[PDB]
Scaffold this active site. Structure first.
Site, mmCIF file in Angstrom:
data_model
loop_
_atom_site.group_PDB
_atom_site.id
_atom_site.type_symbol
_atom_site.label_atom_id
_atom_site.label_comp_id
_atom_site.label_asym_id
_atom_site.label_seq_id
_atom_site.Cartn_x
_atom_site.Cartn_y
_atom_site.Cartn_z
ATOM 1 N N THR A 55 0.833 -1.193 0.000
ATOM 2 C CA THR A 55 0.000 0.000 0.000
ATOM 3 C C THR A 55 0.865 1.239 0.000
ATOM 4 O O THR A 55 1.935 1.277 0.603
ATOM 5 C CB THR A 55 -0.965 0.073 1.204
ATOM 6 O OG1 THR A 55 -1.723 1.295 1.129
ATOM 7 C CG2 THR A 55 -0.215 0.182 2.548
ATOM 8 N N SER A 109 8.740 -2.464 -7.574
ATOM 9 C CA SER A 109 8.809 -2.091 -8.979
ATOM 10 C C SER A 109 10.223 -2.207 -9.593
ATOM 11 O O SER A 109 10.360 -2.286 -10.813
ATOM 12 C CB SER A 109 8.219 -0.695 -9.196
ATOM 13 O OG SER A 109 8.988 0.306 -8.545
ATOM 14 N N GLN A 110 11.264 -2.204 -8.756
ATOM 15 C CA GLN A 110 12.608 -2.405 -9.284
ATOM 16 C C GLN A 110 12.670 -3.800 -9.865
ATOM 17 O O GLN A 110 13.490 -4.075 -10.714
ATOM 18 C CB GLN A 110 13.694 -2.211 -8.239
ATOM 19 C CG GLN A 110 14.006 -3.438 -7.382
ATOM 20 C CD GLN A 110 12.999 -3.628 -6.287
ATOM 21 O OE1 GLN A 110 11.945 -2.976 -6.281
ATOM 22 N NE2 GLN A 110 13.323 -4.477 -5.330
ATOM 23 N N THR A 123 7.492 3.511 -7.782
ATOM 24 C CA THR A 123 7.930 4.636 -8.603
ATOM 25 C C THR A 123 9.119 4.354 -9.536
ATOM 26 O O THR A 123 9.253 4.976 -10.581
ATOM 27 C CB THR A 123 8.243 5.888 -7.706
ATOM 28 O OG1 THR A 123 9.343 5.611 -6.844
ATOM 29 C CG2 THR A 123 7.051 6.212 -6.750
#
Ligand SMILES: [Zn+2]
Ligand SMILES: [Zn+2]
Ligand SMILES: [Zn+2]
Ligand SMILES: [Zn+2]
Ligand SMILES: [Zn+2]
Ligand SMILES: [Zn+2]
EC number: 3.5.1.1
Lengths: 307, 307, 305, 305
Positions: free
Chosen positions: B12, B39-40, B70
């Site tokens: 979250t 996300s990496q 991000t």
């Protein structure tokens, strides 16, 4: 007038005293072609010969201007920032438009570089890049746009001063140690430690990383995602690498902002080094030089915290 | 109220209707955890499952919000921009500060993403990224700073609109074809063509490039210097690669501006493709997809001129 | 080749000093007025707009040479009043035409290319500078001396130019040119609109003098999101309640002055300028005042153009 | 732990709502005044400066909560008048303290860290916002609503903050704090300085009213490199020749208004503001006028502070 030496690393950016005669009214210019190559081909040998030349000839002149291509200018500038021991102004300059193109930027770039190199106030600020009426420090300056004449900017801390009508108002100076205050001395070196850069992105192959390790590269710089993060395959290879002797420095593909220590990754645990505001290509430069002094990642980190 | 589906790809970003209750006053929210990963580590499999999910469920809802890290958000956003066939708003959102940190940005980011997803005026603009009170198009948006909450910006053409007090003023919309107007259809695909990225800089090893060629990679993206230029060793390997079937796309490490066709390099001569304003990671995305349609560099270039 | 007309309002910005123009267009030129852009005025605007609208069917596009000081004002005024859908492209130079590396020559070349590109039509009045095509609404002067100063600080540029080709990736949403309800063909003058600034301890004297001179409208270059120093607020509030159109803009270089945020506009009859900076706001308020004096109708205009 | 004093000038920007402050400093607070920053005025400035200078030896550093509208004005005024070398750090919030994702709490935490870091001393009055340490001279408000609005648009920031640590890589060259010749301890009021704007067809009425009210100085927010619309020029030229200090600044958000460029300043007694934007220029001209009325001496001040 002061005597300024122009060291050329390639072709002319204007077309020198005959191509920009206004030059002979602010300085006494001598020119030497030190190498002739496109900057996309810039390399270690060129870096070493330049640093040595500037260091040998420091007392033959009041200042230096280096004509250089724009593609890797920002790397050379930082190398010299770390290796030149002449506190006299060393000013780099290039051009984003061909010298025969309309509104060619070279002529006035060159003029302003000579203005800068000739101003006593420009001394003792380390190696500078002068472009678009702006005096930029070699550490933070970087190419921000592929074609814009205003491309060079110091995207984290700003420029040192602006140039209007042949005059400079310096309002800043860099804090990170450079020139005579570094322990780097390439004067006897004929080679530099091998350092490569690997890029991170979605689904990134570890292959690039592994090639460098296979070849026994001394260091590897990671252009990470976000705050220096690593794609897992790349994280695994690099972790390995760091345990078997390859220095690993985490930088970022993100154009501004620092890759911070012990933030996104446990550098202490893996023996990695975070690059601070040094983008990948700039991080390569300091890592190479740090490798001529030590291979201990803790000490490499310290070097990254001070230069 | 409209019914908005939130697809989560990881943890979250706020802490959902209980963590940001103000949400239930502007939309009817249902949430599904589609994958859970940093996300990496974003990858093809995740991209494929997301596109398919959005495409299957388009009629079960008025809009989509995708929570995503991000670091590679800008890559996912462009992939979906090319593959989603739901002209309804698909809005991606993440957070630069941990949800439990002071002044956590997630809560309000999420709210504004739901505001955007719920506004009928947001429809038919392709996949969007919403961050820092700004509505950004999936193609041009990119991460500009490692830690700043304002990091996401569309550095060449600008944002689509700004969000004040739950309202949006759209003053722009993208011209490059997306969503239903592309020929890409990943609905039956379980894999994507292999594309890697290689970085250029001074004294760049060709090794990374050669690893990708050895592994039979379908495409390679060059993060070039300046206007997509290549270090010579890299230029030679890539030239070779392109003659033996590896698509080669020239992009740039320079964060803004286009890598132009037939400018710095003779793309026609070498069979290379210039990436326009697509940075390396974004260029990878289109090249991968272009490779499911054709391997002819001329046609790949055409695809790069239209999407 | 396309016929392009260069309408000059001042000194040249090149010098053919740019023979390379023959390769892209048949060029003819007319000196429409001759002034320093810092003295730009209503009369020049009216005559320019009328000239373009009158001459629209004689050429394929227009290029207008103009000083940089108020290029962003004229460009927006033309954006609101040109009724010709052919490309109108404004261009300037930040360096003297005789200085080394003068920017005028290439800027001019780029403006003619823009004016002549068929894809440039229907995007409103344009400003071309530093290899970029910029819309007249959002374009502003960003730096006092840099060649790259012209930028669209809120929404970005419409396109970039490389090697005489434009990759347009944007077009403006706000209605302009023939879509506006303005008509300059009927005007010999424009309503009086002045601009006052806000800052710490700001005197209300500038505002007061404007009102006393019976100004039709006043734009406030406010602080933050269009706020006002107490004394300036007090004065403009009375003015707005007594018939002066009052628009809240902001001294802050980017971002919008929003409605219903900082000030209760309806309560007083104020109008929020949106992304329009004070000088731009002035252009639109003058024009709105040729159509109506009603605050709500003026706000609507500011929400639409 | 370091003793840090929070001096508040308005409403809070947090809400302890930031208990995490106990980890970095012993904090005490005093409400020095209470106003909206858009009504900031000379009186507040004087009292603030006096309070800090009087209280300098009671604490280790100061944090000042202040609205965003005129933060950049107060910060520069304090930069010129604080005679305490301990860190003075101003801080604000762009979002209401009760709004979701309010920025105040973390901004405040970051300001105390800055105020408490021993490396922050001797850099002049600072502004801390969006994880950045910014000098009071160059800092300006860049966007009307964005949390990241505060930037040093000409020379950049002094340092970035991550995880409560600052990597300072810059310090300002322009003299400030005890290096200036200003002394507020002797002032109950400040010279009257107003700001007028330039744009197409600009009325000279604002300038005229300022002069008529016997203003001590006027700053021109000019166009381009500090230029003036004809009528405003004419009026300010007479004013400057008759005793009004006149400073040419610019409406353009970045870059300097240079000397001996656009206008012959010596001919008229005008002063060029450098990188000082109009509101900043005003701060320095007011202060210069407490020391001298001589244009050349004022220009010198503008070249030095
Ligand atoms: Zn340095
Ligand atoms: Zn799209
Ligand atoms: Zn328009
Ligand atoms: Zn129309
Ligand atoms: Zn200072
Ligand atoms: Zn001192």
């Amino acid at each position: 007038l002061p005597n300024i030496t122009i060291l050329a690393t390639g072709g002319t950016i204007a077309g020198l005293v005959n191509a920009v005669p206004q030059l002979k009214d602010i300085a006494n210019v001598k020119g030497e072609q030190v190498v002739n190559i496109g900057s996309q081909d810039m390399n270690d040998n060129v870096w070493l010969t330049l640093a040595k030349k500037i260091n040998t000839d420091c007392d033959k002149t009041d200042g230096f201007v280096i004509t250089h291509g724009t593609e890797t200018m920002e790397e050379t500038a930082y190398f010299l920032d770390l290796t030149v021991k002449c506190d006299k102004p060393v000013v780099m300059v290039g051009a984003m438009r061909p010298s025969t193109s309309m509104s060619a930027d070279g002529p006035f770039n060159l003029y302003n570089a000579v203005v800068t190199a000739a101003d006593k106030a420009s001394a003792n600020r380390g190696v500078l890049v002068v472009m678009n009426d702006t005096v930029l420090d070699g550490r933070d300056v970087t190419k921000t746009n592929t074609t814009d004449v205003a491309t060079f900017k110091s995207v984290n801390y700003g420029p040192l001063g602006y140039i209007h009508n042949g005059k400079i108002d310096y309002q800043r100076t860099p804090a990170r140690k450079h020139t005579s205050d570094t322990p780097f001395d390439v004067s006897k070196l004929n080679e530099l430690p091998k350092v490569g850069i690997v890029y991170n992105y979605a689904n990134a192959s570890d292959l690039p990383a592994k090639a460098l390790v296979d070849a026994g590269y001394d260091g590897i710089v990671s252009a990470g995602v976000g705050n220096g993060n690593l794609y897992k395959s790349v994280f695994d290879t690099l972790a390995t690498a760091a345990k078997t002797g390859t220095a690993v420095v985490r930088s970022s593909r993100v154009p501004t902002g620092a890759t911070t220590q012990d933030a996104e990754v446990d550098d202490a645990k893996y023996g990695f080094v975070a690059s601070g505001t040094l983008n990948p290509q700039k991080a390569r430069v300091l890592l190479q030089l740090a490798l001529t002094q030590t291979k201990d990642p803790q000490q490499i980190q310290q070097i990254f915290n001070q230069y």
